[PDB]
Amino acid sequence: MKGDTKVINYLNKLLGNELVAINQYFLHARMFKNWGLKRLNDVEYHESIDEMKHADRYIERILFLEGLPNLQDLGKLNIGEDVEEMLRSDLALELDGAKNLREAIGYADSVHDYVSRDMMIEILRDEEGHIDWLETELDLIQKMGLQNYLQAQIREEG
Amino acid sequence: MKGDTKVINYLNKLLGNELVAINQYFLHARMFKNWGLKRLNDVEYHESIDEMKHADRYIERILFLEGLPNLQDLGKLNIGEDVEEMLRSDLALELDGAKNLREAIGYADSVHDYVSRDMMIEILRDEEGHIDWLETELDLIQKMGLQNYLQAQIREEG
Amino acid sequence: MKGDTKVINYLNKLLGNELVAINQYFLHARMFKNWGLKRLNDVEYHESIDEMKHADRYIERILFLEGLPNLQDLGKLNIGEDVEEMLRSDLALELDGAKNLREAIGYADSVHDYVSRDMMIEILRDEEGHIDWLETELDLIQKMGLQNYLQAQIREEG
Amino acid sequence: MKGDTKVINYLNKLLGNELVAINQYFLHARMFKNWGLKRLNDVEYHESIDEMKHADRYIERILFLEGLPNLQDLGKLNIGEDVEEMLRSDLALELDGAKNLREAIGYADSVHDYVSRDMMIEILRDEEGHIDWLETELDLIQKMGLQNYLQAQIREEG
Amino acid sequence: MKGDTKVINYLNKLLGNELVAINQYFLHARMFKNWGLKRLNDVEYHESIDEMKHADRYIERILFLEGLPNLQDLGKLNIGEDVEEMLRSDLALELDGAKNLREAIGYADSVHDYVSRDMMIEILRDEEGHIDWLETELDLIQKMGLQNYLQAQIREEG
Amino acid sequence: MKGDTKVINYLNKLLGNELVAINQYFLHARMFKNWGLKRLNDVEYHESIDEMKHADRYIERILFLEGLPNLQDLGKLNIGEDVEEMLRSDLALELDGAKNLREAIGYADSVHDYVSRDMMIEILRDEEGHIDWLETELDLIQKMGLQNYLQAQIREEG
Amino acid sequence: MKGDTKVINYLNKLLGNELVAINQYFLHARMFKNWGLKRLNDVEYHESIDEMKHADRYIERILFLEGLPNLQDLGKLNIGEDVEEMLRSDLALELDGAKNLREAIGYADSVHDYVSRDMMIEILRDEEGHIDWLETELDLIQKMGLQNYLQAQIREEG
Ligand code: HEM
Ligand code: HEM
Ligand code: HEM
Ligand code: HEM
Ligand SMILES: [Fe+3]
Ligand SMILES: [Fe+3]
Ligand SMILES: [Fe+3]
Ligand SMILES: [Fe+3]
Ligand SMILES: [Fe+3]
Ligand SMILES: [Fe+3]
Ligand SMILES: [Fe+3]
Ligand SMILES: [Fe+3]
Ligand SMILES: [Fe+3]
Ligand SMILES: [Fe+3]
Ligand SMILES: [Fe+3]
Ligand SMILES: [Fe+3]
Ligand SMILES: [Fe+3]
Ligand SMILES: [Fe+3]
């Protein structure tokens, strides 16, 4: 079904966001794993998979809309060589993505692409979940100090 | 069954106590949850529910006694913006409630409202449980430091 | 995540609505129970619990949004000393709440707080359920007369 | 298999009858449901589905007979704004349908379309079931009064 | 609960759309079945049932909104005497329905009938599913030719 | 129980029809099987068995009616050396049988042998099933071509 | 454990190969899915996941070797707007990857990085599997024609 060009563009933009998150989240995860921070690996890993699913949703939607998914262009990744830096990177990435989503959502509404709008709101709902988690962890680092915090990541959370 | 006016008054007073505890305990719980202190959330939550049950007991008793439950008037809540402050608030709230209970109990005895008396003693038994827990937790914060204590609240206690 | 001030205000307003419903619905329930109207007790009770859940959703959202939940200020409760009066009170309360919701929803949309918007729409969906139920019951009182209607409430609906 | 034109015509006529019943029965059902008359909703609903099945039988038979099912032309629906009026409408609708069936059956016999005849007799058997139920219900309203009758429709019949 | 007149009108319009789809989808299904195209029968049948459910949702909503469902007026059906023609008819019907939905949705938003809006978006979500399916099938007819395509419909898809 | 002579005669005539169908259907089946057309073998086989059952019904009825079943006289079989020819043979055979049935049925009615009549109508119901299937298959051969059609007969239809 | 720089470089190169395959394979998959070619979707999807796993193996190895995984730089993707073109693209991609692997393997051997060598040989073993499948499929398109081939991709292979 032919979709709005501007909409399809937003979709690809959003898809681009996910593609970046996938890679960042995944690398961070294995870095945590490499460092022996199992708890953190599990989390990041999971979040990474969620972005993979969000991306799949985007790709399928664009395709349905008879558009062309853009997986070629990859945005800048901001790794970080320490736990807090990494969490702060993700956070920043998430905040930006949310920013784009809200813009895209408002647009879909005006062009009456309600099915795309709803999809994005669902994804936004998820993103805000990643946001909360990341902020809460960052706050804990500060509250209990890094050494205790890291001690808390060595074992998998049952 | 027509009950003693003075008794029904004590009941409503006690009910008022519970109504305040419900809200305080519940807010504190979600605040802990928001902060990532699962263990603390679970506890506060549970205690909050206990208050809700106590209140139900009160409401039903007053109604049986052909009185009028008072849910309109809500006492002052003392939140607190930090773990210890919050626990200290609850503690203070609990101590006061107990104080009222003892007064109410002694009164019910004199007016021969033994069934109300026994109910209140049961509830008192519970409250003192809340008291012990609270004191114990406050003592622990002091004993191991806040950073270790907080670190201990992150995971739910299986 | 820092949220829109105006939004957080609406949230607390809505939370205030629920807090009132919780108390009204709960008292009415036990009043019905006291009167031997099991069917009615079960219903009101259930509805009361739903408002408790709606309130929890509000509290957590405000907290996430780095705002301050308001459980201190309690609106006016309108009890009623008879079945129909009570149902009419609830109805009125529900209608007002819905009115506020629609206002809040429209606002969240404009400020692009889509996740809050969606939450509220879900809650609205529920509220309208309470509305339908209450109207339908009120219509039946009139249609079969009070004596038959009350006869219909003595036993729990399987 | 090429069928008798006149027969196929009767079939479509009968199909038309069913199409009307489907809509009437279904609307009445939801109206009852809307009014809180569960027992009545269940019944009407069920009857509505039966009509849908009858229609399917008709459609398939006409098609087999290499004819053209007529779903375009919809007869007059007679709703009714009250329980008895609605039941009386259905009754009237059913009586007419039966009238047509008998005519169609007698005709199929003469043209030797025995397989169509038998099908219709089966359907007739069903319709007369709808008839009995309807009459019985109308008689009951009269016998116990509308208020008692309505009171009896609130709960689903286990 | 009294609803917006204009909204109720859109609802009935949408209901009218479904009523047409029900009949078209159902007839096409049995036509496919008559032709020995099981796979196609199953699909159309299923889709037909979905429109029946969508219609039920509409009817109940209008009723709740204290409006009058319109099942009397039936739109034009466009059958088609061949597989592709039939699929193209459905497609066209679906596209139009979606067109109406988007209009209705945008309107409900402005009048603040958020619960109706959300319902419609859900239904729209479904409709677009029918759309995708129908386009994909039409594309396959062209890609593998009719004779192979029909060969592919004789057996039920497990 | 002594039955009408003329009726018993029709019965034997009908029995004769079945005896021919049994042999034709069975031979065709194994021919299909021999050719590797499993799907077709299964079908023909099944149909062949149905004829066998029909015959049993006839034999038992005639015997009950104190008549003499005629299994000695076997009508002309029309095999055919190709799929379509075979299906066309069966079709012709079925059409004739139906023709006889209708005649027999009408007769049983006049002589008041209602139990025989009903039996025959049941059997007729079955035969028309064989008819539909046969026509449908012949239509498909034409529609998709013989090569695609044959390709579709190789595997058993699960 | 500090690893050979040149080795780590090969690893990242190989990782880069996988990153490209992930995206290409995944997009192709959903494109097939969008087109209704389930069988093809399942395959591509699976292959896409394999690439994801291979990449994970690479990332973890580089990290262990105290190197820096490179997920930022994404090679050129060659989509293709038709089934054969897509399969040919993948094939080409796979052939190149294998080419790099063999080079990397031979190198690891000389530098005595046997554990990396073995890992790569395992991955190579997998890739050659992807290769065979691809060639086989391309050969089949040619052998049976595209129309028959496509017809064979519609249903998932149980
Ligand atoms: C601060 C406002 C309140 C909040 C946020 C709240 C919240 C809750 C929640 C979330 C539940 C669990 C619901 C479920 O999962 O099914 C619950 C249960 C309950 N609440 Fe409340 N509540 C509040 C006030 C009250 C009041 C005033 C009463 C009246 C005494 C009350 C009585 C109850 C009862 C009887 C239960 C059921 C516990 C059980 O299952 O045994 N609540 N509440
Ligand atoms: C007034 C319009 C109609 C409405 C509102 C309606 C509604 C429904 C609903 C809600 C169901 C149950 C679906 C489920 O839960 O899976 C159903 C089933 C069904 N309907 Fe309809 N329908 C309508 C018209 C028709 C027509 C015209 C036909 C064609 C004869 C038809 C044929 C069927 C059939 C065959 C079933 C399946 C029953 C079974 O499971 O055996 N309906 N309908
Ligand atoms: C042309 C000669 C016939 C052949 C080659 C034939 C073949 C068969 C075969 C292979 C079976 C399945 C046996 C099994 O696997 O259990 C069967 C079943 C049967 N046959 Fe025949 N048959 C013939 C004639 C007849 C006749 C003349 C009758 C009498 C009416 C008859 C009545 C039956 C019955 C009642 C069954 C059991 C059906 C069931 O499974 O419920 N057959 N036949
Ligand atoms: C083109 C971008 C990508 C897409 C669209 C994508 C998509 C997916 C999807 C949909 C799943 C299944 C999720 C589930 O159902 O739970 C998955 C699994 C997975 N992905 Fe990705 N992915 C992409 C890139 C990557 C990358 C770069 C990596 C890093 C090497 C990766 C690693 C994984 C892993 C390890 C799994 C789990 C497989 C298992 O369960 O064993 N993915 N992917
Ligand atoms: Fe995401
Ligand atoms: Fe995210
Ligand atoms: Fe208490
Ligand atoms: Fe307490
Ligand atoms: Fe609520
Ligand atoms: Fe409510
Ligand atoms: Fe009927
Ligand atoms: Fe009927
Ligand atoms: Fe629909
Ligand atoms: Fe549709
Ligand atoms: Fe037979
Ligand atoms: Fe036969
Ligand atoms: Fe690989
Ligand atoms: Fe590969």
PDB file of N, CA, C and O in Angstrom, chain C residues 58-108:
ATOM      1  N   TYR C  58      -0.555   6.076  37.711  1.00  0.00           N
ATOM      2  CA  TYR C  58      -0.320   7.533  37.766  1.00  0.00           C
ATOM      3  C   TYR C  58       0.914   7.882  38.579  1.00  0.00           C
ATOM      4  O   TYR C  58       1.791   8.607  38.142  1.00  0.00           O
ATOM      5  N   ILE C  59       0.955   7.332  39.776  1.00  0.00           N
ATOM      6  CA  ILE C  59       2.054   7.587  40.710  1.00  0.00           C
ATOM      7  C   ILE C  59       3.400   7.244  40.087  1.00  0.00           C
ATOM      8  O   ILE C  59       4.331   8.022  40.117  1.00  0.00           O
ATOM      9  N   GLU C  60       3.473   6.070  39.499  1.00  0.00           N
ATOM     10  CA  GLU C  60       4.717   5.615  38.867  1.00  0.00           C
ATOM     11  C   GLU C  60       5.129   6.492  37.682  1.00  0.00           C
ATOM     12  O   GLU C  60       6.296   6.788  37.483  1.00  0.00           O
ATOM     13  N   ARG C  61       4.143   6.919  36.922  1.00  0.00           N
ATOM     14  CA  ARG C  61       4.391   7.788  35.751  1.00  0.00           C
ATOM     15  C   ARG C  61       4.948   9.154  36.149  1.00  0.00           C
ATOM     16  O   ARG C  61       5.906   9.655  35.561  1.00  0.00           O
ATOM     17  N   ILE C  62       4.318   9.736  37.153  1.00  0.00           N
ATOM     18  CA  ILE C  62       4.742  11.048  37.687  1.00  0.00           C
ATOM     19  C   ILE C  62       6.159  10.954  38.212  1.00  0.00           C
ATOM     20  O   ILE C  62       6.989  11.808  37.954  1.00  0.00           O
ATOM     21  N   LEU C  63       6.411   9.881  38.951  1.00  0.00           N
ATOM     22  CA  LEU C  63       7.736   9.627  39.534  1.00  0.00           C
ATOM     23  C   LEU C  63       8.788   9.471  38.454  1.00  0.00           C
ATOM     24  O   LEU C  63       9.875  10.025  38.537  1.00  0.00           O
ATOM     25  N   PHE C  64       8.441   8.705  37.437  1.00  0.00           N
ATOM     26  CA  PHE C  64       9.349   8.484  36.303  1.00  0.00           C
ATOM     27  C   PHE C  64       9.676   9.832  35.671  1.00  0.00           C
ATOM     28  O   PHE C  64      10.829  10.178  35.438  1.00  0.00           O
ATOM     29  N   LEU C  65       8.620  10.610  35.473  1.00  0.00           N
ATOM     30  CA  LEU C  65       8.706  11.973  34.927  1.00  0.00           C
ATOM     31  C   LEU C  65       9.362  12.984  35.873  1.00  0.00           C
ATOM     32  O   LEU C  65       9.391  14.192  35.631  1.00  0.00           O
ATOM     33  N   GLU C  66       9.902  12.455  36.951  1.00  0.00           N
ATOM     34  CA  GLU C  66      10.612  13.241  37.955  1.00  0.00           C
ATOM     35  C   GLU C  66       9.743  14.323  38.584  1.00  0.00           C
ATOM     36  O   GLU C  66      10.192  15.419  38.865  1.00  0.00           O
ATOM     37  N   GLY C  67       8.482  13.989  38.781  1.00  0.00           N
ATOM     38  CA  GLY C  67       7.518  14.905  39.384  1.00  0.00           C
ATOM     39  C   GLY C  67       7.205  14.405  40.792  1.00  0.00           C
ATOM     40  O   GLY C  67       7.821  13.447  41.272  1.00  0.00           O
ATOM     41  N   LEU C  68       6.255  15.052  41.450  1.00  0.00           N
ATOM     42  CA  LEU C  68       5.852  14.681  42.823  1.00  0.00           C
ATOM     43  C   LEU C  68       4.384  14.275  42.959  1.00  0.00           C
ATOM     44  O   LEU C  68       3.497  15.132  42.904  1.00  0.00           O
ATOM     45  N   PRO C  69       4.121  12.972  43.140  1.00  0.00           N
ATOM     46  CA  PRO C  69       2.754  12.513  43.268  1.00  0.00           C
ATOM     47  C   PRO C  69       2.090  13.197  44.437  1.00  0.00           C
ATOM     48  O   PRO C  69       2.719  13.404  45.473  1.00  0.00           O
ATOM     49  N   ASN C  70       0.831  13.561  44.255  1.00  0.00           N
ATOM     50  CA  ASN C  70       0.074  14.245  45.312  1.00  0.00           C
ATOM     51  C   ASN C  70      -1.015  13.348  45.869  1.00  0.00           C
ATOM     52  O   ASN C  70      -2.082  13.204  45.281  1.00  0.00           O
ATOM     53  N   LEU C  71      -0.732  12.763  47.020  1.00  0.00           N
ATOM     54  CA  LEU C  71      -1.695  11.900  47.722  1.00  0.00           C
ATOM     55  C   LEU C  71      -2.260  12.572  48.970  1.00  0.00           C
ATOM     56  O   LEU C  71      -3.110  12.030  49.662  1.00  0.00           O
ATOM     57  N   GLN C  72      -1.775  13.769  49.233  1.00  0.00           N
ATOM     58  CA  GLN C  72      -2.180  14.522  50.423  1.00  0.00           C
ATOM     59  C   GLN C  72      -3.575  15.130  50.312  1.00  0.00           C
ATOM     60  O   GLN C  72      -4.394  15.056  51.232  1.00  0.00           O
ATOM     61  N   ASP C  73      -3.806  15.765  49.182  1.00  0.00           N
ATOM     62  CA  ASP C  73      -5.068  16.462  48.921  1.00  0.00           C
ATOM     63  C   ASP C  73      -6.145  15.518  48.419  1.00  0.00           C
ATOM     64  O   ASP C  73      -6.020  14.908  47.357  1.00  0.00           O
ATOM     65  N   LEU C  74      -7.186  15.394  49.222  1.00  0.00           N
ATOM     66  CA  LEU C  74      -8.302  14.507  48.918  1.00  0.00           C
ATOM     67  C   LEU C  74      -9.554  15.301  48.608  1.00  0.00           C
ATOM     68  O   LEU C  74     -10.018  16.081  49.416  1.00  0.00           O
ATOM     69  N   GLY C  75     -10.116  15.047  47.438  1.00  0.00           N
ATOM     70  CA  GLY C  75     -11.348  15.715  47.019  1.00  0.00           C
ATOM     71  C   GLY C  75     -12.558  15.299  47.839  1.00  0.00           C
ATOM     72  O   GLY C  75     -12.507  14.411  48.687  1.00  0.00           O
ATOM     73  N   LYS C  76     -13.660  15.975  47.575  1.00  0.00           N
ATOM     74  CA  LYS C  76     -14.927  15.717  48.263  1.00  0.00           C
ATOM     75  C   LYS C  76     -15.523  14.378  47.856  1.00  0.00           C
ATOM     76  O   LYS C  76     -15.592  14.027  46.690  1.00  0.00           O
ATOM     77  N   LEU C  77     -15.958  13.633  48.857  1.00  0.00           N
ATOM     78  CA  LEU C  77     -16.597  12.342  48.643  1.00  0.00           C
ATOM     79  C   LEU C  77     -18.085  12.577  48.772  1.00  0.00           C
ATOM     80  O   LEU C  77     -18.518  13.314  49.641  1.00  0.00           O
ATOM     81  N   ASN C  78     -18.860  11.938  47.920  1.00  0.00           N
ATOM     82  CA  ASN C  78     -20.318  12.035  48.003  1.00  0.00           C
ATOM     83  C   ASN C  78     -20.896  10.638  48.152  1.00  0.00           C
ATOM     84  O   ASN C  78     -21.161   9.933  47.189  1.00  0.00           O
ATOM     85  N   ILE C  79     -21.058  10.250  49.398  1.00  0.00           N
ATOM     86  CA  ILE C  79     -21.527   8.900  49.768  1.00  0.00           C
ATOM     87  C   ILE C  79     -22.939   8.548  49.295  1.00  0.00           C
ATOM     88  O   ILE C  79     -23.129   7.900  48.269  1.00  0.00           O
ATOM     89  N   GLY C  80     -23.931   8.982  50.038  1.00  0.00           N
ATOM     90  CA  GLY C  80     -25.305   8.644  49.680  1.00  0.00           C
ATOM     91  C   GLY C  80     -25.749   7.553  50.635  1.00  0.00           C
ATOM     92  O   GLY C  80     -24.986   6.641  50.953  1.00  0.00           O
ATOM     93  N   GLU C  81     -26.980   7.665  51.110  1.00  0.00           N
ATOM     94  CA  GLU C  81     -27.511   6.701  52.078  1.00  0.00           C
ATOM     95  C   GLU C  81     -28.463   5.657  51.523  1.00  0.00           C
ATOM     96  O   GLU C  81     -29.188   4.999  52.257  1.00  0.00           O
ATOM     97  N   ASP C  82     -28.443   5.503  50.215  1.00  0.00           N
ATOM     98  CA  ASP C  82     -29.305   4.524  49.561  1.00  0.00           C
ATOM     99  C   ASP C  82     -28.655   4.081  48.269  1.00  0.00           C
ATOM    100  O   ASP C  82     -27.881   4.819  47.665  1.00  0.00           O
ATOM    101  N   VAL C  83     -28.996   2.868  47.859  1.00  0.00           N
ATOM    102  CA  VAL C  83     -28.420   2.240  46.659  1.00  0.00           C
ATOM    103  C   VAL C  83     -28.357   3.142  45.426  1.00  0.00           C
ATOM    104  O   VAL C  83     -27.298   3.358  44.856  1.00  0.00           O
ATOM    105  N   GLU C  84     -29.497   3.675  45.032  1.00  0.00           N
ATOM    106  CA  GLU C  84     -29.555   4.512  43.836  1.00  0.00           C
ATOM    107  C   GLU C  84     -28.728   5.781  43.965  1.00  0.00           C
ATOM    108  O   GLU C  84     -28.038   6.190  43.048  1.00  0.00           O
ATOM    109  N   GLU C  85     -28.819   6.393  45.128  1.00  0.00           N
ATOM    110  CA  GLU C  85     -28.076   7.620  45.405  1.00  0.00           C
ATOM    111  C   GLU C  85     -26.580   7.359  45.277  1.00  0.00           C
ATOM    112  O   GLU C  85     -25.836   8.133  44.702  1.00  0.00           O
ATOM    113  N   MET C  86     -26.172   6.225  45.807  1.00  0.00           N
ATOM    114  CA  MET C  86     -24.766   5.813  45.759  1.00  0.00           C
ATOM    115  C   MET C  86     -24.279   5.591  44.326  1.00  0.00           C
ATOM    116  O   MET C  86     -23.237   6.084  43.914  1.00  0.00           O
ATOM    117  N   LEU C  87     -25.077   4.867  43.568  1.00  0.00           N
ATOM    118  CA  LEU C  87     -24.753   4.601  42.161  1.00  0.00           C
ATOM    119  C   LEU C  87     -24.712   5.897  41.345  1.00  0.00           C
ATOM    120  O   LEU C  87     -23.896   6.082  40.446  1.00  0.00           O
ATOM    121  N   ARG C  88     -25.617   6.796  41.675  1.00  0.00           N
ATOM    122  CA  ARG C  88     -25.656   8.095  41.001  1.00  0.00           C
ATOM    123  C   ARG C  88     -24.441   8.954  41.349  1.00  0.00           C
ATOM    124  O   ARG C  88     -23.940   9.691  40.512  1.00  0.00           O
ATOM    125  N   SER C  89     -23.983   8.834  42.587  1.00  0.00           N
ATOM    126  CA  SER C  89     -22.782   9.549  43.051  1.00  0.00           C
ATOM    127  C   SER C  89     -21.570   9.076  42.257  1.00  0.00           C
ATOM    128  O   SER C  89     -20.814   9.874  41.693  1.00  0.00           O
ATOM    129  N   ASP C  90     -21.408   7.766  42.226  1.00  0.00           N
ATOM    130  CA  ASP C  90     -20.283   7.158  41.501  1.00  0.00           C
ATOM    131  C   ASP C  90     -20.307   7.630  40.057  1.00  0.00           C
ATOM    132  O   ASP C  90     -19.324   8.151  39.532  1.00  0.00           O
ATOM    133  N   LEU C  91     -21.467   7.478  39.445  1.00  0.00           N
ATOM    134  CA  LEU C  91     -21.670   7.892  38.049  1.00  0.00           C
ATOM    135  C   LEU C  91     -21.165   9.313  37.822  1.00  0.00           C
ATOM    136  O   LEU C  91     -20.335   9.569  36.966  1.00  0.00           O
ATOM    137  N   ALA C  92     -21.648  10.224  38.645  1.00  0.00           N
ATOM    138  CA  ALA C  92     -21.242  11.633  38.559  1.00  0.00           C
ATOM    139  C   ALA C  92     -19.730  11.768  38.683  1.00  0.00           C
ATOM    140  O   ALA C  92     -19.090  12.491  37.931  1.00  0.00           O
ATOM    141  N   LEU C  93     -19.172  11.045  39.638  1.00  0.00           N
ATOM    142  CA  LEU C  93     -17.718  11.057  39.858  1.00  0.00           C
ATOM    143  C   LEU C  93     -16.975  10.572  38.609  1.00  0.00           C
ATOM    144  O   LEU C  93     -15.987  11.169  38.180  1.00  0.00           O
ATOM    145  N   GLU C  94     -17.484   9.480  38.038  1.00  0.00           N
ATOM    146  CA  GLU C  94     -16.895   8.915  36.847  1.00  0.00           C
ATOM    147  C   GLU C  94     -16.933   9.867  35.664  1.00  0.00           C
ATOM    148  O   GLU C  94     -15.945  10.091  34.995  1.00  0.00           O
ATOM    149  N   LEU C  95     -18.087  10.463  35.453  1.00  0.00           N
ATOM    150  CA  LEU C  95     -18.293  11.417  34.346  1.00  0.00           C
ATOM    151  C   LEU C  95     -17.311  12.580  34.391  1.00  0.00           C
ATOM    152  O   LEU C  95     -16.761  12.994  33.371  1.00  0.00           O
ATOM    153  N   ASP C  96     -17.105  13.094  35.592  1.00  0.00           N
ATOM    154  CA  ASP C  96     -16.160  14.194  35.816  1.00  0.00           C
ATOM    155  C   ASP C  96     -14.734  13.772  35.515  1.00  0.00           C
ATOM    156  O   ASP C  96     -13.975  14.488  34.869  1.00  0.00           O
ATOM    157  N   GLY C  97     -14.381  12.601  36.015  1.00  0.00           N
ATOM    158  CA  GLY C  97     -13.044  12.055  35.782  1.00  0.00           C
ATOM    159  C   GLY C  97     -12.741  11.938  34.293  1.00  0.00           C
ATOM    160  O   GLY C  97     -11.702  12.383  33.812  1.00  0.00           O
ATOM    161  N   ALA C  98     -13.696  11.367  33.574  1.00  0.00           N
ATOM    162  CA  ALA C  98     -13.604  11.219  32.111  1.00  0.00           C
ATOM    163  C   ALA C  98     -13.383  12.592  31.463  1.00  0.00           C
ATOM    164  O   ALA C  98     -12.548  12.772  30.581  1.00  0.00           O
ATOM    165  N   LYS C  99     -14.136  13.555  31.964  1.00  0.00           N
ATOM    166  CA  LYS C  99     -14.051  14.935  31.477  1.00  0.00           C
ATOM    167  C   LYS C  99     -12.622  15.461  31.600  1.00  0.00           C
ATOM    168  O   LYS C  99     -12.047  16.030  30.672  1.00  0.00           O
ATOM    169  N   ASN C 100     -12.039  15.227  32.757  1.00  0.00           N
ATOM    170  CA  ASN C 100     -10.642  15.639  33.008  1.00  0.00           C
ATOM    171  C   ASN C 100      -9.648  14.902  32.112  1.00  0.00           C
ATOM    172  O   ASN C 100      -8.743  15.495  31.549  1.00  0.00           O
ATOM    173  N   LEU C 101      -9.852  13.601  32.000  1.00  0.00           N
ATOM    174  CA  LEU C 101      -9.000  12.755  31.170  1.00  0.00           C
ATOM    175  C   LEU C 101      -8.878  13.272  29.742  1.00  0.00           C
ATOM    176  O   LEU C 101      -7.788  13.453  29.225  1.00  0.00           O
ATOM    177  N   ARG C 102     -10.027  13.517  29.141  1.00  0.00           N
ATOM    178  CA  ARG C 102     -10.108  14.011  27.751  1.00  0.00           C
ATOM    179  C   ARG C 102      -9.314  15.298  27.577  1.00  0.00           C
ATOM    180  O   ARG C 102      -8.624  15.503  26.595  1.00  0.00           O
ATOM    181  N   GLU C 103      -9.410  16.143  28.585  1.00  0.00           N
ATOM    182  CA  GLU C 103      -8.676  17.408  28.613  1.00  0.00           C
ATOM    183  C   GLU C 103      -7.170  17.157  28.701  1.00  0.00           C
ATOM    184  O   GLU C 103      -6.365  17.744  27.971  1.00  0.00           O
ATOM    185  N   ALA C 104      -6.811  16.262  29.610  1.00  0.00           N
ATOM    186  CA  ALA C 104      -5.407  15.881  29.825  1.00  0.00           C
ATOM    187  C   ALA C 104      -4.804  15.227  28.592  1.00  0.00           C
ATOM    188  O   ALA C 104      -3.691  15.517  28.191  1.00  0.00           O
ATOM    189  N   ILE C 105      -5.576  14.332  27.996  1.00  0.00           N
ATOM    190  CA  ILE C 105      -5.155  13.595  26.786  1.00  0.00           C
ATOM    191  C   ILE C 105      -4.851  14.545  25.631  1.00  0.00           C
ATOM    192  O   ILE C 105      -3.779  14.515  25.053  1.00  0.00           O
ATOM    193  N   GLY C 106      -5.808  15.419  25.356  1.00  0.00           N
ATOM    194  CA  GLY C 106      -5.641  16.420  24.311  1.00  0.00           C
ATOM    195  C   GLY C 106      -4.391  17.266  24.552  1.00  0.00           C
ATOM    196  O   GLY C 106      -3.661  17.632  23.631  1.00  0.00           O
ATOM    197  N   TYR C 107      -4.136  17.557  25.814  1.00  0.00           N
ATOM    198  CA  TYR C 107      -2.960  18.362  26.180  1.00  0.00           C
ATOM    199  C   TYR C 107      -1.640  17.616  25.958  1.00  0.00           C
ATOM    200  O   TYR C 107      -0.707  18.142  25.378  1.00  0.00           O
ATOM    201  N   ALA C 108      -1.585  16.385  26.436  1.00  0.00           N
ATOM    202  CA  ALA C 108      -0.394  15.536  26.281  1.00  0.00           C
ATOM    203  C   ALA C 108      -0.004  15.420  24.811  1.00  0.00           C
ATOM    204  O   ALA C 108       1.178  15.431  24.456  1.00  0.00           O
TER     205      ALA C 108
END
